[PDB]
Design an enzyme around this catalytic site. Structure first.
Site, PDB file in Angstrom:
ATOM      1  N   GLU A 101       1.137  11.020 -25.520  1.00 29.22           N
ATOM      2  CA  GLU A 101       0.293   9.836 -25.419  1.00 29.22           C
ATOM      3  C   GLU A 101       0.372   9.071 -26.727  1.00 29.22           C
ATOM      4  OE1 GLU A 101      -3.730  10.378 -24.229  1.00 29.22           O
ATOM      5  OE2 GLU A 101      -3.297  11.912 -22.713  1.00 29.22           O
ATOM      6  N   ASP A 127     -11.506  11.135 -19.618  1.00 28.69           N
ATOM      7  CA  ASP A 127     -11.439   9.673 -19.589  1.00 28.69           C
ATOM      8  C   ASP A 127     -10.749   9.157 -18.337  1.00 28.69           C
ATOM      9  OD1 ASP A 127     -11.750   7.000 -20.465  1.00 28.69           O
ATOM     10  OD2 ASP A 127      -9.720   6.999 -21.327  1.00 28.69           O
ATOM     11  N   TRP A 149       0.916   6.342 -23.382  1.00 33.22           N
ATOM     12  CA  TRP A 149      -0.296   6.272 -22.593  1.00 33.22           C
ATOM     13  C   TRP A 149      -0.579   4.799 -22.395  1.00 33.22           C
ATOM     14  CZ3 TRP A 149      -2.027   9.914 -19.775  1.00 33.22           C
ATOM     15  CH2 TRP A 149      -3.289   9.814 -19.191  1.00 33.22           C
ATOM     16  N   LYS A 153      -4.734   0.786 -21.242  1.00 29.19           N
ATOM     17  CA  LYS A 153      -3.564   1.112 -22.052  1.00 29.19           C
ATOM     18  C   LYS A 153      -2.265   1.095 -21.254  1.00 29.19           C
ATOM     19  CE  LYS A 153      -5.833   3.823 -25.728  1.00 29.19           C
ATOM     20  NZ  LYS A 153      -7.206   3.873 -25.152  1.00 29.19           N
ATOM     21  N   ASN A 212      -4.878  19.763 -21.495  1.00 29.18           N
ATOM     22  CA  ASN A 212      -4.817  18.485 -22.211  1.00 29.18           C
ATOM     23  C   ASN A 212      -6.009  18.356 -23.142  1.00 29.18           C
ATOM     24  OD1 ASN A 212      -3.604  15.535 -22.418  1.00 29.18           O
ATOM     25  ND2 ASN A 212      -5.833  15.272 -22.213  1.00 29.18           N
ATOM     26  N   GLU A 213      -5.726  18.264 -24.440  1.00 32.02           N
ATOM     27  CA  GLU A 213      -6.734  17.987 -25.468  1.00 32.02           C
ATOM     28  C   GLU A 213      -7.904  18.970 -25.418  1.00 32.02           C
ATOM     29  OE1 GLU A 213      -7.636  13.729 -25.386  1.00 32.02           O
ATOM     30  OE2 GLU A 213      -5.779  13.352 -26.469  1.00 32.02           O
ATOM     31  N   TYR A 264      -7.257   4.269 -32.211  1.00 34.38           N
ATOM     32  CA  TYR A 264      -8.494   4.976 -32.543  1.00 34.38           C
ATOM     33  C   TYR A 264      -8.671   5.218 -34.036  1.00 34.38           C
ATOM     34  CZ  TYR A 264      -9.235   5.741 -27.602  1.00 34.38           C
ATOM     35  OH  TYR A 264      -9.451   5.531 -26.254  1.00 34.38           O
ATOM     36  N   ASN A 303      -0.806  13.879 -28.730  1.00 42.75           N
ATOM     37  CA  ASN A 303      -1.487  12.647 -28.346  1.00 42.75           C
ATOM     38  C   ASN A 303      -2.026  12.040 -29.626  1.00 42.75           C
ATOM     39  OD1 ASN A 303      -1.019  13.502 -25.740  1.00 42.75           O
ATOM     40  ND2 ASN A 303      -3.197  13.833 -25.246  1.00 42.75           N
TER      41      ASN A 303
END
Ligand code: USL
Ligand code: USL
Lengths: 598, 596
Positions: free
Chosen positions: A504, A170, A549, A568, A412-413, A473, A467
């Site tokens: 985040e 993203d 974030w 954000k 990350n993720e 979300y 996160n």
């Protein structure tokens, strides 16, 4: 090894940044060997900078493939007596470097430095320096690109006009010569190639263990000087390994930095390294900096400013640090790629704590048969592990001596709740722990997932970095529901007894949108979102940090959920505070850096 | 005086000293206590190049009065001492004192033009400290001019300020610091090139470059001219200091179609390469001729202004700004109100953007009862002497730029009052004497009730007008603005010489709208420009339109400044307002040549 190029009594430093020639590849630039001649029918492009936003052309911004940068390199012949090195701080994503039409090096990985000697026999009176830059991303690059022409963020299918990079992350795919290109020199026969420092506190005395990597034969000398210039340790003819001690050492502390000057000499070669003395340790549910329980206050950032994109922006680096001190922050994470050395050196000098992160975002193939992320390369799984190891090696090689770096983030993720994840990551954690001389904590930054108890971070990480978007979300515009679902999960993490934190959490917020009644995208909703999360986290004794974030709005790919990028930020893209920025200035002003949860 | 742009050559090192420097505000005792003799204690860190005022969040830093001290370490290889070692400051705003180790090397006045100094080799120790003290104070003797009472140029009830502050006599924020890069460079000690002068001759269908090469020491000179691809098209060895070279197949530098030859010069071991565009400029009758064709200016007054560096060199923004001007269909801008960086000038040469090159002379007006140009001993302005040095230095720096077509001697001086002609006559004489290309000279005219007594009429080759019909007069009465505009501009048109707008505009806050004429709205900005154009499009001697301003920019604080000046077609972060799209459309229908 990658010491930061500096001007010394033995080392020239010549910056090659400025206006370079620039040309898009039309599919023939290698076939017609554009690097052998002056680029023809070209544009001009500032270096360093991402090239996507400098002009007004969508075709430039959304280019797929290679571009060519070029400039003249007419260097004094006196330098032929020295060793001559071309240092590229970062070229995103992959590079081929030519001098006078001879390929000198290639590099894979858009956010870490590389260098090559110019052979003396290649240097003419006039020289061409050409850099070919590849922007393409796929299942084998870090960051990961999608290979299916779908968007990570359509209601009716369509055929794209041209082939484009499809990020599996993203943030906008800014490419080009992102960070400075410099020519530097060292002596030819004997020179310093790396320096490794570690420290230990014995009462008020610090022991600094050093390893000085060198090329050639000569005598090594090391000296440690205070900021004010007083020598406080010196040992001569020590060879590669050794140690020395500082009486009544001033420690490096968050928001109260102190850097010694470490002067190294090897034959004719001279190098000065700034160095802060501090300890990092996880003990129980505590993150101990200098043996005190730290509480992280800060953000995930991006290297993102207008119009240079990802490009080095040194006034804005100073502005951002000044804003974090205004707000009362103490830390940030380098999401989602290593930042410039200039930022890292400034964080050391300003006292800002850093979670240093690799480029490994998008390692997730489930974000004609279905595929598992960590299936065999043969069976279609992700192809990033070998490059992932190289990124870990190079990141730690570059940043190991920074006092500001307190924790490594391996990815990350990624798809850490699926089968095979543990087998992918365990060697990378083992690699990070083997290579960091300071043995700092390691984490992976954990994607929000339904099977969170199955996240392999539990088996691997010293700190659980989450996160989570309770109220954005999920539970959007239902902050009561958000508070209950946040508590249910975070109590689980809190019950493991190890330190955990938010890396985040936030809510897209368009400056200038307001409502007194909870409404997503408004400035008031951003504040209420954070208040609701803090209701939970403030009651959990293992929760040792909050990083929002994001620090500031930044550019992303286009999509129906991205209101001209990611909104954000606590600050706008031009660093203006939203309502929630003032909320956090108040909140962080009442929370100490140490002893908040003691 | 000669100020060749520093470049990396076969004979010349170029070391950029930009980065993080130490920084300390002076408290009145900085020189007394000789801070430049040690490391700065209890200091901050400041990016270089940058203005310092906006980097932090401190109002006292932003609004500091007086001196600051920058400092860095400078540990250089000893083998440099076999060369001539030069410290080049591209700009330090406003005044500088430069120290190496304990020793004052030079002092400079004037915040927007380069200065340099040799570093004597007996001074270079093993480790060295470079200290630069920077003064931000402005008064009746500086350019730009500061007011010497408590008056603001932009009050209802009188008050005593908490601290003393600079009071600009100009509408832009007093950004100061090490504005532009600091570099160390070298040349051969014993024979080196000190300056290069190039002019073009296009007569008889034969393009020629005339050169004049200024040297120090004794050696042989050579010059070669090369195309962009590297083909040598003229060359001569063992030449004189002056001479000429014929360029067969010469391609002319044209607005929005640049062509730059590379002119390589040799003198002993020294090597210097200068990009050069071949083109002619001349005023004939009511036409501004570039390459013998009647030019129409389309563009802007600009500022060097970006966040957070302030006036500081921002090369990505320079490239973005030129891209926006080409997107909008502009061909030109003016360096309002000071010389811009050489990096900008060189990029404009590369991109084909025409430049009106302006001095630092803004605020030369004491009556926005002592008259501005009274004798100094009776309170008159004290700038004329420095005004000559600025003109000398500006022309010496920029003389070889093809993009520069016109010199602007001052912005909005008190040119309708007694004594202005006598103040300005020697400055116009000087600019014409010094420019080897003898380009047109102007001063930019303030709006003024007695405009027929503007001494620009007696001095200037092009009349350049700043007018605000529909903003500072006739606000929200555009029908009256049109009538007032036509009455005065028919006077200017009747003089038969080229004239033009160098400023016109309306403060416009992005996001404020109204279908019905309302000041500060995006629609009013468009209607303001439509009204003016209704008049200018009917006047055959009106040869150019440069709006005020390219983009919103920072100013001093006051009741009529909405977070700075809002007259930009773009915002400070370069986003188009409604009027920016209006101009893209308009300028797309107006040719660079042969409009009038
Ligand atoms: O997330 C995605 O990808 C899609 C999301 N939505 C959401 C409802 C927005 C789609 C909607 C579709 N309908 C399309 C037109 N309808 C008319 O349009 C106006 C508007 O939506 O602006 C409404 O206000 C009017 O009342 C209504 O008549 C709405 C719904 C659709 F065909 C595809 C999508 C997506 O693909
Ligand atoms: O409060 C008021 O009533 C007025 C206030 N001010 C001052 C600016 C506070 C006036 C100024 C006038 N001059 C001052 C600057 N000249 C150009 O104008 C640009 C701009 O002002 O936008 C500047 O930025 C350019 O640098 C400069 O060249 C225009 C003419 C004037 F004629 C009337 C007024 C007022 O009436």
């Amino acid at each position: 090894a990658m010491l930061y190029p500096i001007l010394t009594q033995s080392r020239m430093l010549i910056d090659l940044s400025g206006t370079w020639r620039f040309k898009l590849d039309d599919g023939s630039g290698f076939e017609k060997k554009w690097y052998e001649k002056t680029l023809d029918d070209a544009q001009l492009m500032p270096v360093p900078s991402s090239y996507n936003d400098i002009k007004e052309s969508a075709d430039l911004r959304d280019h797929y493939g290679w571009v060519f940068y070029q400039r003249d390199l007419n260097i004094p012949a006196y330098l032929k007596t020295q060793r001559i090195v071309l240092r590229f701080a970062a070229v995103t994503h992959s590079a081929k470097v030519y001098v006078n039409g001879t390929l000198l090096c290639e590099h894979k990985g858009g956010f870490l430095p590389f260098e090559t000697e110019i052979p003396e026999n290649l240097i003419r009176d006039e020289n061409l320096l050409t850099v070919a830059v590849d922007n393409r991303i796929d299942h084998s690059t870090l960051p990961v690109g999608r290979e299916d022409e779908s968007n990570v963020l359509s209601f009716f299918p369509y055929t794209p006009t041209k082939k484009q990079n499809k990020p599996n992350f993203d943030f906008f795919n800014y490419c080009g010569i992102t960070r400075p290109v410099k020519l530097y020199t060292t002596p030819k026969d004997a020179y310093i190639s790396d320096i490794t420092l570690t420290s230990s506190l014995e009462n008020n005395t610090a022991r600094i263990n050093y390893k000085i990597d060198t090329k050639g034969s000569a005598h090594t000398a090391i000296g440690v000087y205070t900021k004010q210039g007083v020598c406080v340790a010196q040992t001569e003819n020590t060879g590669t390994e050794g140690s020395l001690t500082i009486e009544n050492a001033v420690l490096w502390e968050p928001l109260k930095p102190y850097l010694y000057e470490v002067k190294i000499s090897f034959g004719e070669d001279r190098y000065t390294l700034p160095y802060g003395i501090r300890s990092v340790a996880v003990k129980g549910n505590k993150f101990l900096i200098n043996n005190k329980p730290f509480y992280f206050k800060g953000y995930g950032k991006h290297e993102d400013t207008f119009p240079a994109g990802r490009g080095l922006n040194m006034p804005m680096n100073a502005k951002d640090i000044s804003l974090m001190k205004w707000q009362g922050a103490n830390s940030f994470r380098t999401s989602h790629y290593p930042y410039s050395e200039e930022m890292m050196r400034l964080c050391d000098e300003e006292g800002i704590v850093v979670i240093d992160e690799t480029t490994a975002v998008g390692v997730h193939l489930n974000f004609g048969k279905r595929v598992n992320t960590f299936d065999p390369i043969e069976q279609g799984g992700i192809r990033t592990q070998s490059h992932h190891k190289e990124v870990i090696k190079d990141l730690i090689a570059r940043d190991k001596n920074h006092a500001c770096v307190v924790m490594w983030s391996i990815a990350n993720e990624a798809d850490t709740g699926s089968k095979g994840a543990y087998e992918y990551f365990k060697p990378l954690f083992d690699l990070a722990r083997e290579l960091d001389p300071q043995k700092r904590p390691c984490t992976l930054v954990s994607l929000q997932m339904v099977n969170y108890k199955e996240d392999c971070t539990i088996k691997l990480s010293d700190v659980f970095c989450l996160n989570r978007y309770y109220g954005w979300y999920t539970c959007g515009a239902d902050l009561q529901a958000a508070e209950k679902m946040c508590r249910e999960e975070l109590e689980f993490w809190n019950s493991l007894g190890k330190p955990f934190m938010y890396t985040e959490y936030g809510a897209d917020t368009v400056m200038g949108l307001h409502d007194t009644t909870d409404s997503m995208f408004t400035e008031e909703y951003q504040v209420e979102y954070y208040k609701t999360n803090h209701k939970v986290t403030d009651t959990l004794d293992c929760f040792i940090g909050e990083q929002v974030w994001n620090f500031a709005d930044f550019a992303t790919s286009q999509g129906l959920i991205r209101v001209q990028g990611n909104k954000k930020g606590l600050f706008t893209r031009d660093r203006k505070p939203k309502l929630a920025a003032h909320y956090f200035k108040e909140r962080w002003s009442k929370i100490p850096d140490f002893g908040y949860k003691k």
